[PDB]
Amino acid sequence: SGGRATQSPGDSRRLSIQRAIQSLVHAAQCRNANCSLPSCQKMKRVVQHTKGCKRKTNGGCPICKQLIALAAYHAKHCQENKCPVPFCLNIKQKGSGGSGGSGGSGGSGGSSQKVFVSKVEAVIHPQFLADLLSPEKQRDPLALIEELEQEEGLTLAQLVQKR
Ligand SMILES: [Zn+2]
Ligand SMILES: [Zn+2]
Ligand SMILES: [Zn+2]
């Protein structure tokens, strides 16, 4: 009757995905000016990126990929067709798939963004997730982002060529 979750290194970072996803939903429908929360302000930036973006799904910007990842992962745990979450909407119209995600409640995340099924999660780069969750102020996701697209050249590409 549900359940069935194991706390892998991935789980913890998928939980950071789900946690940034919790952020996502919030900034997606936050219209309270009195609210100036850390995860909210940083995500207000990251969300506003998703809309004012052009290289969105072209694969250039890291955000929109990890945001269609968040919004998708989120969309799996979402039952709203008229959702506030941006890419959740286009998920229901384009990104069709099953349910699931993670939920083992692990806290020992690690480099597991290769072995896993990279169907949803493109360049989520949990550091970005972590920074949203961080009470710190000048710890912006979009700052990480430009860093992330730089590091998008490293790993997976590492020793990938073969015969
Ligand atoms: Zn807010
Ligand atoms: Zn973008
Ligand atoms: Zn949604």
From Swiss-Prot:
Coiled coil (UniProt feature): none
Zn finger spans (TAZ-type): 10-91
Subcellular location: Cytoplasm; Nucleus; Chromosome
Residue(s) carrying Phosphoserine: S8
Protein modification: Acetylated on Lys at up to 17 positions by intermolecular autocatalysis. Sumoylated; sumoylation in the transcriptional repression domain (CRD1) mediates transcriptional repression. Desumoylated by SENP3 through the removal of SUMO2 and SUMO3.
Source domain of life: Eukaryota
Free-text domain note: The CRD1 domain (cell cycle regulatory domain 1) mediates transcriptional repression of a subset of p300 responsive genes; it can be de-repressed by CDKN1A/p21WAF1 at least at some promoters. It contains sumoylation and acetylation sites and the same lysine residues may be targeted for the respective modifications. It is proposed that deacetylation by SIRT1 allows sumoylation leading to suppressed activity.
Quaternary assembly: Interacts with HIF1A; the interaction is stimulated in response to hypoxia and inhibited by CITED2. Probably part of a complex with HIF1A and CREBBP. Interacts (via N-terminus) with TFAP2A (via N-terminus); the interaction requires CITED2. Interacts (via CH1 domain) with CITED2 (via C-terminus). Interacts with CITED1 (unphosphorylated form preferentially and via C-terminus). Interacts with ESR1; the interaction is estrogen-dependent and enhanced by CITED1. Interacts with HIPK2.
Illness association: Defects in EP300 may play a role in epithelial cancer.
Protein name per its UniProtKB record: Histone acetyltransferase p300
Annotated organism of origin: Homo sapiens (Human)
Portion of the full-length sequence here: 1723 to 1812 of 2414
